Amino acid sequence: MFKAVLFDLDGVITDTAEYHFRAWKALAEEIGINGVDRQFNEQLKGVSREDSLQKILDLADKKVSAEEFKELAKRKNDNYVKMIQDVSPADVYPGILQLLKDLRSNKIKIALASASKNGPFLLERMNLTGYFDAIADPAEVAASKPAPDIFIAAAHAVGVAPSESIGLEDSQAGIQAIKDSGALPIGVGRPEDLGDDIVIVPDTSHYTLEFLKEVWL
Ligand SMILES: O=P(O)(O)[C@H](F)[C@@H]1O[C@H](CO)[C@@H](O)[C@H](O)[C@H]1O
Ligand code: ALF
Ligand SMILES: [Mg+2]
Q: In which residues is beta-D-glucose 6-phosphate bound?
């Protein structure tokens, strides 16, 4: 039986992928780049803050100074951080709180495998910190999604092999990261975005321990 579940945060635990989208779109438009729509944003889900900004700059073949690049990433983050201040336990996605409870009762480890420096703040806002056996610090890994490092690090933090872990993700980059870690991915979203080659569910209510067992079998 799998011995750990490795959670992405944004778009898996709560609807903060939507806020990341709105914040990046606002930033892009401030600098005259208009191609950040929902379709393009699929390339920004799961991607580090700096890689995300660079994808936006590249989309328009735009070059900025190092000083401007730093200011832009900070600006988007500051807006995003304002956006999430009222996140509460009511914003936890359906199924997630119960999954966390059921996993603990069955002695299955729980780790966060998020790119986000805002991860600890968000888990606190949602009263979820106490469910997590570990939070992998995204600043510690040498490479971010789609590299597998963050999922490998989450599994290590809870003493479980990636091959005996399930990873939960809403993003193209994150699914690739889970695959290359050795963990089993279960995506949440549209197979049109996430592929027809892995198990995908339409919403997080489907993330039950029963179903995770169904899939693992
Ligand atoms: O919250 P941040 O900026 O530290 C983190 F890098 C964010 O991670 C998301 C995925 O969990 C992204 O999709 C997002 O672009 C990003 O800024
Ligand atoms: F949506 Al994440 F790390 F929280 F890619
Ligand atoms: Mg995500």
A: 10, 46-47, 49, 116-118
- Contacts of residue 37, defined as CB under 8 A and 6 or more positions apart, other chains included, come to 25
Based on the domain organization, do 102 and 67 belong to the same domain?
A: no
Ligand 2 interacting residues, C-beta cut-off 6 A: 8-11, 17, 46, 114-116, 145, 171, 174
Active site residue 203: no
> Which of 10, 78, 91, 149 does the annotation list as catalytic?
10
List phi, psi (to 5°) of 71: -65, -40
Atom 1 in ligand 1: residue holding the nearest Cα: 116
Question: Last residue of some domain: 92, 118, 140?
Answer: 92
Cβ count near 29 (within 10 Å) = 12
Per the annotation, the verdict on 10 as an active-site residue is yes
164's CB contacts (< 8 A; 6+ apart) are 2, 3, 4
Annotated resolution, angstroms:
1.5
Run of H or E residues at 200? strand 199-201
Tokens of 103: 């996993």
Sort residue 127 into left (φ over 0), alpha (ψ -120 to 50) or beta.
left
Look up the domain containing 26 and give its range.
Answer: 15-92
9 lines ligand 1 (CB under 6 A): yes
Mark whether 120 and 194 lie in a shared domain: yes
* CATH classification of the domain holding 106: 3.40.50.1000
